[PDB]
Write a protein that binds this ligand. Sequence first.
Ligand SMILES: O=C(c1cc(Cc2n[nH]c(=O)c3ccccc23)ccc1F)N1CCN(C(=O)C2CC2)CC1
Ligand SMILES: [Zn+2]
Length: 208
Amino acid sequence: GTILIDLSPDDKEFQSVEEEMQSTVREHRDGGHAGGIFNRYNILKIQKVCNKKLWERYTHRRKEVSEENHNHANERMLFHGSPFVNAIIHKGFDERHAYIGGMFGAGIYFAENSSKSNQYVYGIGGGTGCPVHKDRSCYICHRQLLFCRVTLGKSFLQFSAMAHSPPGHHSVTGRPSVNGLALAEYVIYRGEQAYPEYLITYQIMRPE
Ligand SMILES: O=C(c1cc(Cc2n[nH]c(=O)c3ccccc23)ccc1F)N1CCN(C(=O)C2CC2)CC1
Ligand SMILES: [Zn+2]
């Protein structure tokens, strides 16, 4: 029961989502190996994801977490990249298909840096790149990210040197401590704690 509403570039909601994509690009320590070499995106489309059952599932869990956390859902808007974005928007996030080999445990991963999420769009470490050209830095093929509403509740703070949530915590904050320009990553252990609100289609742009 998911429908996708296409947003006009003139819509303020399009502009604020775009800004959140563009302004959270950073350089990656892999020199572009996983996600490609770029400083910005060409945003081709932004669609709002609408699915009543998934939304009600989201807001129900949110109220639970809120009540376990001095009335604070600790809701963020975070990026998620994956080859299975088309399954996430119809069926929601599935915690049995989590990142099993994740740095912060088996669970569903999100990023503050759009470019970190961009690294997973074609697979872990970027897989083998785009399906057409096998190119992790393809400037031609269309990529997709989700910009998602995520309940973190009480988040366990894990500093990093870059399954189930810790007892009495609702999520994990994975916070880089060596790269001072790297923003955080987050892990949730329940699919109902994220709702995939926006589906963003884009290309990476070749630096001039
Ligand atoms: O959380 C993951 C996952 C995440 C990753 C890593 C990851 N993926 N995407 C990111 O944006 C990201 C950001 C920071 C750190 C890690 C990531 C790898 C494999 C995975 F299966 N999911 C994969 C796809 N999921 C699904 O429900 C779809 C139906 C199969 C659930 C969520
Ligand atoms: Zn390509």
